[PDB]
Amino acid sequence: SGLRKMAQPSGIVEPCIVRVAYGSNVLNGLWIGDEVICPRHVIASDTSRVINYDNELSSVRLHNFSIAKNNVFLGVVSAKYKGVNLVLKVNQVNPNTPAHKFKSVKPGESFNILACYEGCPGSVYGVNMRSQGTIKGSFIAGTCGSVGYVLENGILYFVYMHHLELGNGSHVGSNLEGEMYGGYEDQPSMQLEGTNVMSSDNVVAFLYAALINGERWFVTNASMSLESYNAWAKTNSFTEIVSTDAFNMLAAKTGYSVEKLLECIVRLNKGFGGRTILSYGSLCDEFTPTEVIRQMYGVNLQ
Amino acid sequence: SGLRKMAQPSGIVEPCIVRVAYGSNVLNGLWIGDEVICPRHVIASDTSRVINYDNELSSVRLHNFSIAKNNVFLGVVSAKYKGVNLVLKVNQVNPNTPAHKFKSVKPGESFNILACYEGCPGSVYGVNMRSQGTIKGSFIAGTCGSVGYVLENGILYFVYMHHLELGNGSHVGSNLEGEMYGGYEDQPSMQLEGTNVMSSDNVVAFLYAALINGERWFVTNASMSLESYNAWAKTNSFTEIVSTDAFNMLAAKTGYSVEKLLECIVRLNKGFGGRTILSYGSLCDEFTPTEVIRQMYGVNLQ
Ligand SMILES: *C(=N)[C@H](C[C@@H]1CCNC1=O)NC(=O)[C@@H]1C[C@@H](C(F)(F)F)CN1C(=O)[C@@H](NC(=O)OC)C(C)(C)C
Ligand SMILES: *C(=N)[C@H](C[C@@H]1CCNC1=O)NC(=O)[C@@H]1C[C@@H](C(F)(F)F)CN1C(=O)[C@@H](NC(=O)OC)C(C)(C)C
């Protein structure tokens, strides 16, 4: 029993983290093959005013880079922008490059953050991509370049590189192609996050987890069609459910239909009445159906 | 900005996990050197009735063990009890044995759980040892033998191996010397957990983190001495603060004294009144002062 936000093991990613320093800036880079990827703003001369990245790459001095992993320093051969990321060809192939692919995470999907501090892997935790392309993590100075990843059907996927934090505390990053999530820009300009839309798929899985544990106070006999629930969701800042097929095992083992839980959401969306579901005071959308299944009946851990 | 329960990177521990099966029981073992450690109840024939471990070790058939790591199967040479743990001498040294030590965590101290499912490392997350020697994690069938660890001053410490779950959902394990935390017995008896005592040191760190992030609704002009709070905490299931010299840094740069936060605890212990601190609905004692400092000003990462 028990539900906890988790991260997939990080051992495969740790050997790819390097310290990247340029001028007075220090952050992290991803060393895979003969290439080091890091946020391009590390070569910006002043991150307090608008940045002319064209005029930063053209004045860059390759010898002024300092890339290191445990007293092993790499020389930069060439530098180019891949989106908002610098792609640095280095003079040494990473001997510990794992088999890997690249992909982007979508709203509601969970992935792992390897929080790195000035080149030192420090912690690992699970996160969830929000509707506006942001995550609510724990990033501070020197953690840019921290990598996000997911393991699926035994394949490492690099899906996130940290770039900045918005004024409201939300954390913005990019994919490994340099496309910033949510369309945000790596500039010190005032940028706003829209209304957050809660993942209905994850809230259903969250309620399934409570039932599996033994918490049943919020359930009744009432049900609601995915069509009636989707109509409400479009006006209550909730996503629309595309299928119940992802909840087949949960429904089979609990004996509760997705529609019965769709009704619990609209009813519980008005207030838990001082009550609690798995120690949470309101609806939680941080656990995906896969995350719940992995913890309750350790199946398909990747 | 941001506070999230995190785990230290697990790459150093992952290569020590093996699948241990005996008869119909399947769980995890820690393969370090020429020895594999796992909960001794893996040789129990019936885990629904009292177990005579003396008569189980005497009837044990070493060849009935199945220990494997990928395509590497290990042969058991000898077996002995170290407390509640089975110590199995094997015919092969783990080539990836890391430098390590063993120690026990104390109440209020945090550590990392590498959740393994029948020999497959599946996830990693942080936990906090409670006063009664239990943790509130997420363990299910087949996760016994999952190991807890901490990285301190560049030293890997093995500090936990999971054994069982109590009727109230609390999770029980032992250190690697075989001493069950909290004094529980590795028997299917209906054992009881006493009143949980909140770690005052960790709740203070939690409030410091909230202030650093930007929350202040809970702040008043009042403060409370450490003698007055300690007297209040002997009767409200909170630990006694022995010294404020663990928060000098947090108090110095937040501009709030421990005494102010001690008053916030006594008042907030009666309910947040619908409000939330860092998204929590009640006082949280799961973050140690060190954990907070690590996330707010990345220092002492190990
Ligand atoms: C990378 N190490 C930091 C991470 C940042 C520090 C505090 N909280 C965090 O997560 N990233 C940055 O410093 C970027 C780099 C600059 C720019 F994005 F290229 F312009 C500015 N950065 C910011 O994060 C700023 N945020 C912002 O620009 O909002 C538009 C702040 C938060 C002011 C550092
Ligand atoms: C190991 N894989 C499991 C983990 C267990 C499964 C469900 N929740 C968990 O954490 N551990 C066990 O099955 C032990 C082994 C037996 C014994 F401890 F040796 F007696 C029984 N176990 C239990 O966990 C039981 N709990 C218990 O004994 O209370 C003291 C339950 C969960 C009732 C099987």
Author numbering:
A (entry chain B), B (entry chain A): 1 to 302
Paper text:
Coronaviral Mpro is a 3C-like cysteine protease that cleaves the viral polyproteins (pp1a and pp1ab) at evolutionarily conserved sites to release non-structural proteins which are essential for viral replication and transcription in host cells. Due to its indispensable role in viral replication, evolutionary conservation among coronavirus genera (alpha, beta, gamma, delta), and absence of mammalian homologs, Mpro stood out as a promising drug target for developing pan-coronaviral therapeutics. In this study, we present crystal structures of Mpro from the feline coronavirus strain FECV-UU23 in complex with four clinically relevant inhibitors: GC376, PF-00835231, nirmatrelvir, and ibuzatrelvir. Our structural findings reveal that the active site of UU23 Mpro maintained conserved catalytic residues in addition to distinct, lineage-specific structural plasticity, especially in the loops forming the substrate binding subsites.
